[PDB]
Amino acid sequence: QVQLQESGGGLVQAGDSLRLSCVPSVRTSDNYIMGWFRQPPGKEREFVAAIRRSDGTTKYAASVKGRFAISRDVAKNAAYLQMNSLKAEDTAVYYCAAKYQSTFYSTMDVQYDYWGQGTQVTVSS
Amino acid sequence: SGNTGSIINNYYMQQYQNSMDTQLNDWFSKLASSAFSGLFGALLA
């Protein structure tokens, strides 16, 4: 059905910033929730930040609350995760996701539908 | 007949939907309609 195209990964060192992007392949008229999951080396996947398509309702993790910022482009049908002031612990594999089926805030970080192959972000010190 | 908006009759009889009043007068309607208006004394328009 829907495939996700990720962009903007790479390598930085501590203190810099990165910008991740993700655009879905089809532009159906749904209320999907673009989110970001990260999987640290030798650990399991976990939620980072999500955003709703209709409004700019953003969820966040306790780890990254003041640093990270997520936004959406209504025109280009995109979503961007602006990572700021990276820590050496932010090294992981970052995945996007879709979650088309239900769009309520209380469940905005539990069950996504389409993932799309992850990007690699490896910050140094 | 207040706040009911269906045109079709009820499925249940009147004996079961609500109770039945027995016998053996709106005061304030008549008290307002019998109010004084006009003027008092003469008028010079």
Binding site: - | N3, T4, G5, S6, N10, Y11, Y12, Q15, Y16, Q17, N18, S19, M20, D21, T22, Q23, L24, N25, D26, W27, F28, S29, L31, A32, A35, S37, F40
Partner: protein
Amino acid sequence: GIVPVACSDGYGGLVTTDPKTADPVYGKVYNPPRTNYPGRFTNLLDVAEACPTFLCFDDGKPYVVTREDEQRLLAKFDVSLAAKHMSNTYLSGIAQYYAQYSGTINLHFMFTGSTDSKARYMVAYVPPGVETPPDTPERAAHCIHAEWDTGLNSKFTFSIPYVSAADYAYTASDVAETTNVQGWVCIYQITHGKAQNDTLVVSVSAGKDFELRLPIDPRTQ
């Protein structure tokens, strides 16, 4: 077979003001007869017409007192069911539960001075368009007004007109924005003879074409 139906989506849930009924569980119940029970009202505006209640001026009094001064402005209040003077009225207590209104609002002026004390009063309706109301009857004589003195008949009723742009008005003033959307009502003391502490009681009731429109439930509960 049997009749096929489409269980539509969006339909079915409970709305607290919906116009349909419930299904009974207790049949054949007869009430005790209440034929010709006294004091029934089927409309709130009937009671609001027939029964006027008092206004609340400074110090929380239902009346304004003549003043031994150069000032001839007894009282002044906004044309608003949310005014400070109407806070203790039945018209206002009803109007708090509705969104909009339109029509006439009657004011009653009862003189309670002695026989040997005379006076002449004036009330003017000051529609919106000025920043501050007038404080002289000579200057408020250019609005809609009425004059009356004291005598055998001790009551006087003046009817505030509904004049505005829209067909309805809000029964609640929005925010700290000033200059009430409707006008003011200004009571004046044209003159008085030997009326030093005599008072004039004011009350308000609904007019002939008064109306409240959209029921709400606005109080903190």
